[PDB]
């Protein structure tokens, strides 16, 4: 078992907003992505604008201060650190992608579900239908469901 948060109340903060989308839509995408994981665990997530957030949500490009640079449009879409202090748990999204609420560009909600998976301690799945499968695939957002494998994984960690 890899690192896990040692508490069930977890805060997040949106450090900055991509100009690709309206602010309200970014807030909504992120809130709904956390909700996907809270629905199958004892974890609760609260958004704060001030103070010490556990999970910082960041949009940045290229080399952005951690040792994992982004690569321009395409390729790496985002990445996240496992549970831990400071940069631990933080999720970074490549601003060189075009973030959307839909099937065009890269869907922020689906990507955030995957990255939050990592922020909570999950690794990759070999189930092509798992949200934790390594490669991005748009799926109908209104019918989205975690796979049984994603649920097994997160339930093995919490709690």
Ligand X SMILES: NC(=O)[C@H](CCC(=O)O)NC(=O)[C@H](CCC(=O)O)NC(=O)CCc1cc(-c2ccccc2)no1
Using rule CB under 6 A, residue 58 touches ligand X = no
| DSSP, res 143 | G
Chosen residue from 5, 20, 114, 131 binding Ca ion by CB under 5 A: 20
Structure tokens that stand for 54 in this block: 């556990």
Which of Zn ion, ligand X, Ca ion, none does 20 bind, CB closer than 5 to 8 A by kind? Ca ion
Which position's Cβ is nearest Zn ion? 92
Convert 135-146 to b/e letters by CB count within 10 Å (16 or more is b). eeeeeeeeeeeb
Chosen residue from 26, 57, 95, 131 binding Ca ion by CB under 5 A: 95
Backbone angles phi, psi at 60, to 5 degrees: -155, 165
Helices first, then strands: H and E counts in the chain: 3, 7
Task: Return the bridge partners of 78, or none.
Answer: 93
Using rule CB under 5 A, residue 153 touches Ca ion = no
Binding marks (x or -) toward Zn ion, 64..93, rule CB under 5 A?
A: --x-------------------------x-
24 is an active site residue: no
Exactly one of 34, 78, 99, 115 is catalytic; which is it? 115
Q: Binding-site residues for Zn(2+), please?
A: 64, 66, 79, 92, 114, 118, 124
Q: Binding-site residues for Ca(2+), please?
A: 20, 54, 71-72, 74, 76, 86, 88, 90, 94-95, 97
Whose CA is closest to 136, among 104, 98, 116, 106?
106
H or E segment to which residue 150 belongs: helix 148-157
Binding site for Zn ion (CB under 5 A): 66, 92
Active site residues: 115
């Amino acid at each position: 078992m890899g690192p896990v948060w040692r508490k069930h109340y977890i805060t997040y903060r949106i450090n900055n907003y991509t100009p690709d989308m309206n602010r309200e839509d970014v807030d909504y995408a992120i809130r709904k992505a956390f909700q996907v994981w809270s629905n199958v665990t004892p974890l609760k997530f609260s958004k704060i604008n001030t103070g010490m957030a556990d999970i910082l949500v960041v949009f940045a490009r290229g080399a952005h201060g951690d040792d994992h640079a982004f690569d321009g449009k395409g390729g790496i879409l985002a990445h996240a650190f496992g549970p831990g202090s400071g940069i631990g748990g933080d999720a970074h999204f490549d601003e060189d992608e075009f973030w959307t609420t839909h099937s065009g560009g890269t869907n922020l909600f689906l990507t955030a579900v995957h990255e939050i998976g990592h922020s909570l301690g999950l690794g990759h799945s070999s189930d092509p239908k798992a949200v934790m499968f390594p490669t991005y695939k748009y799926v109908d957002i209104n019918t989205f469901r975690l796979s049984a494998d994603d649920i097994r994984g997160i339930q093995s960690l919490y709690g």
